[PDB]
RNA sequence: UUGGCACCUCGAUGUCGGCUCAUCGCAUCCUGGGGCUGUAGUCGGUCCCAAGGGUUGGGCUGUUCGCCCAUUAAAGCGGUA
RNA sequence: CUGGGGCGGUCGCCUCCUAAAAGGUAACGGAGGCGCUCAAAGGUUCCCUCAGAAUGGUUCAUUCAUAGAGUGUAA
RNA sequence: UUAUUGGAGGUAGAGCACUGUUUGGACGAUUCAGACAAACUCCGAAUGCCAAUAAUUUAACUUGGGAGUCAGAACAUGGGUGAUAAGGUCCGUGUUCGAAAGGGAAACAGCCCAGACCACCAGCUAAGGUCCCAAAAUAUAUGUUAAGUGGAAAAGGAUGUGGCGUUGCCGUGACACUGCGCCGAAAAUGUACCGGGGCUAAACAUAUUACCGAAGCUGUGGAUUGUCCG
RNA sequence: CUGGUGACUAUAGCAAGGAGGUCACACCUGUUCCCAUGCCGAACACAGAAGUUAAGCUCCUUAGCGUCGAUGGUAGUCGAACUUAUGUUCCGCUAGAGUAGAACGUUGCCAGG
């Protein structure tokens, strides 16, 4: 039901659209994390930045 | 030397050389063929030299199809000139050859004779080639 | 005159198709439409036996459909059959 | 040395779509700039002297098929 | 060939209409019916 | 080499030839070793190894270069602003 | 302006390609045009349909012909 | 920003229905087969763009005061130009430098990792690494190479060697594909591109388990500025 | 069932064969009246009804040309990792061509039978 997302890779050197998706996910600094409700929009954001984040199920 | 009798535009962008051969990847007119395995421009002079080698080795007894034609002009600047001041004049004509394309086909001779004629032609070309037969099944 | 085809279940990714063709199988479709795969060597032997427009008894799963070769995709580089279509003769 | 006889171009005219399908537009809004009828005027849409397609009422833009090889743009009142 | 033309009707000094003509094709003094704001009606405006 | 580019230098990086003094590379001019030869011999042709040493004195031209005279085993080709 | 400067060429406007399927997008990149014309070649109502080919005739007629013609002018 | 939905448009590719280019047949220009195109298109994506109403997020706009900037650079990628030359040049797109320290790439603005408020003789990681210089594996399993290949290059040449095979003869030929090596391989102060020592693995290809490694993150204390509830 | 008039990307068309015509739709008859011919009662227009399904038109049958068209695979490509190789790998999207096949229209309203 809930997803924990951790920003595992830096946004330095990443395209601005990927940075914008990182910010819209609520992630702030490297290794910061958010807990969000699982739904297709959140899944799409995660899919866009999957190389930069780690997802686990709560 | 093969070249178009006329073109609409004599000054053309050079063609893209990445990717694989769009078509002409099969022997359709003759019995044996020479298939390119690497990419290069092929010039009309190279085509003429290869054709002469082939026809000389088979004594003009079989028959050859040149499957490529040099449709594309390319320009070259005059010697010792700086950059700019417009595009240079036409220097020659090239055909784009990519892996898979059949360059020449031959018919009317034995397999060994065709193989030797095609080896002699291949040594005149800026690409690596392979002897091929018509594909069945 | 006989050849066993293994049914491909679900979607196969591009990696799956590459691994199949490396292991030596040819993907094919029988036409309900069925996605199958065969062995290239055994297919070559059956085609040699029966001719290009011959008749084959394709063992799809448990059944046995009398099919021919409607079309085939080939790779002139590497000399490899890459896809087969089997039309049920009816 | 030599010289080139080319080197001319006119100003770009910024043609093409100006409002989206499903967008609300006030009357008089230009919907499409074009040379000729690349897209035709449909319902409540006019065609200007320079082929400009514009809305004749307020409403929602709909780009739609017109036969096999043509298309048109209409504007439908929201209500 | 082509010259500028000014049309003015008898009962007005407005001279509000200018137009063009080919001097070779139309050597005459061209006449046309044009609306005259002063008289609120159409009148015979003729090239000067 | 002739160039292309314009990246160091315009509050200065002296330009050609020669003289003096060299130093390095080897695609070796001579000398040393060797294969083939359409190598009889004496001579040659060509290729391989080889950089130890050696490798000119004049006429003309500012010349580099080049031509010529007379030699020499040979009068090598390049790099070092 | 300028792949130093000079010499040569260019300087405003229109169309296309380069231009990466919205728009925009540079080079002394690749191609052309404009500095008008028309008293109808404008408005409106009504009517009409082309190029080419074949077949016959000392332009005339038939059949195929979605335009392969025409649209004042460059695209 | 993403999800869904709708739309505009002609690139990549493809194709030859138009224009143009082109190769073989056959027939009495037509037809058949097969090719080429920035300024060809019967076709046509991925993307990107414009909009509409859900999830996440934090801007956005207007008006006034004050600026600086108008020499850009490399890298990657789509292109023009040049010569599929340039650390060349001109545009599109993204990143970094500029204005960015720290770790890696020997050294090395522009590459890889990563954004330094201050203090610590705490911990976990990134790229990159673990024989010695020099922190951490002379780690584990399987195989390849014998060239110091690794640690700079081609056409082309070859009983080098490993793995797949197809066939002819009855051990062995012919053939094709593929992995790693060999030759082709000549420059100028001095070995002289592995950074050095050295290495036959301390090379290479898979797979695994650990550890090292930054000014990244965490832990402890402190400073300043903000919100929310000292 | 026919006819008028609409909607729909030719799955609707085109072509080749059959059946039909009492009312209707037509071919047809005439040029006196409205009207009409760069010339022509061909067409347009008006009067009609001798005649004929011959044609147009309607129904039935052919996949022949055209049209539509999958699934599967391929090209290309967003993103990512490797990499500098006319590249490789993974992932999502996914053509064009060609194949199976579909298709000899469906359908709203009004009027007649
Ligand atoms: K310039
Ligand atoms: K454009
Ligand atoms: K064509
Ligand atoms: Mg083809
Ligand atoms: Mg108008
Ligand atoms: Mg106008
Ligand atoms: Mg130089
Ligand atoms: Mg520059
Ligand atoms: Mg200076
Ligand atoms: Mg000084
Ligand atoms: Mg030597
Ligand atoms: Mg003297
Ligand atoms: Mg100049
Ligand atoms: Mg675009
Ligand atoms: Mg555009
Ligand atoms: Mg001009
Ligand atoms: Mg002028
Ligand atoms: Mg293309
Ligand atoms: Mg540069
Ligand atoms: Mg470059
Ligand atoms: Mg850029
Ligand atoms: Mg600065
Ligand atoms: Mg730094
Ligand atoms: Mg920054
Ligand atoms: Mg380095
Ligand atoms: Mg360092
Ligand atoms: Mg710095
Ligand atoms: Mg650790
Ligand atoms: Mg140690
Ligand atoms: Mg080495
Ligand atoms: Mg060393
Ligand atoms: Mg090292
Ligand atoms: Mg920190
Ligand atoms: Zn007046």
Tab-separated table of C-alpha atoms in Angstrom, chain D residues 18-79:
chain	number	residue	atom	x	y	z
D	18	UNK	CA	-2.284	28.135	-32.051
D	19	UNK	CA	-4.840	26.438	-29.778
D	20	UNK	CA	-5.183	22.830	-28.693
D	21	UNK	CA	-7.960	20.340	-29.261
D	22	UNK	CA	-10.134	20.419	-26.166
D	23	UNK	CA	-9.061	23.959	-25.236
D	24	UNK	CA	-11.553	26.735	-24.501
D	25	UNK	CA	-11.230	29.798	-26.749
D	26	UNK	CA	-12.948	33.170	-26.865
D	27	UNK	CA	-14.561	34.258	-30.110
D	28	UNK	CA	-12.055	35.549	-32.634
D	29	UNK	CA	-9.200	33.402	-31.332
D	30	UNK	CA	-6.899	32.305	-34.131
D	31	UNK	CA	-6.828	28.507	-34.249
D	32	UNK	CA	-4.580	27.775	-37.226
D	33	UNK	CA	-2.124	29.678	-39.441
D	34	UNK	CA	-1.491	28.133	-42.855
D	35	UNK	CA	-0.897	28.588	-46.573
D	36	UNK	CA	-3.938	27.182	-48.350
D	37	UNK	CA	-6.425	24.852	-46.676
D	38	UNK	CA	-4.155	22.357	-44.987
D	39	UNK	CA	-6.994	22.285	-42.432
D	40	UNK	CA	-10.554	23.329	-43.284
D	41	UNK	CA	-12.968	25.546	-41.334
D	42	UNK	CA	-15.599	23.424	-39.619
D	43	UNK	CA	-18.474	24.331	-37.326
D	44	UNK	CA	-18.414	27.887	-35.938
D	45	UNK	CA	-14.937	28.437	-37.408
D	46	UNK	CA	-14.073	30.922	-40.128
D	47	UNK	CA	-11.367	31.094	-42.797
D	48	UNK	CA	-9.532	34.392	-43.149
D	49	UNK	CA	-8.191	36.088	-46.238
D	50	UNK	CA	-4.714	34.646	-45.649
D	51	UNK	CA	-6.198	31.156	-44.880
D	52	UNK	CA	-6.150	31.780	-41.101
D	53	UNK	CA	-8.695	29.644	-39.240
D	54	UNK	CA	-10.351	31.468	-36.333
D	55	UNK	CA	-13.178	30.811	-33.887
D	56	UNK	CA	-16.497	32.544	-34.558
D	57	UNK	CA	-17.890	31.890	-31.051
D	58	UNK	CA	-16.590	31.068	-27.602
D	59	UNK	CA	-16.248	27.346	-26.995
D	60	UNK	CA	-14.043	24.263	-27.174
D	61	UNK	CA	-11.750	23.504	-30.120
D	62	UNK	CA	-12.081	20.110	-31.816
D	63	UNK	CA	-9.746	19.000	-34.607
D	64	UNK	CA	-11.580	16.300	-36.549
D	65	UNK	CA	-11.381	14.144	-39.658
D	66	UNK	CA	-13.005	15.444	-42.869
D	67	UNK	CA	-13.337	12.597	-45.348
D	68	UNK	CA	-10.423	10.326	-46.144
D	69	UNK	CA	-7.586	12.790	-46.776
D	70	UNK	CA	-8.741	16.108	-45.248
D	71	UNK	CA	-9.287	17.455	-41.744
D	72	UNK	CA	-11.129	20.374	-40.190
D	73	UNK	CA	-11.371	22.282	-36.920
D	74	UNK	CA	-14.608	23.247	-35.175
D	75	UNK	CA	-15.627	25.084	-32.011
D	76	UNK	CA	-18.500	23.790	-29.864
D	77	UNK	CA	-20.231	25.792	-27.135
D	78	UNK	CA	-19.504	24.583	-23.600
D	79	UNK	CA	-23.052	25.124	-22.256
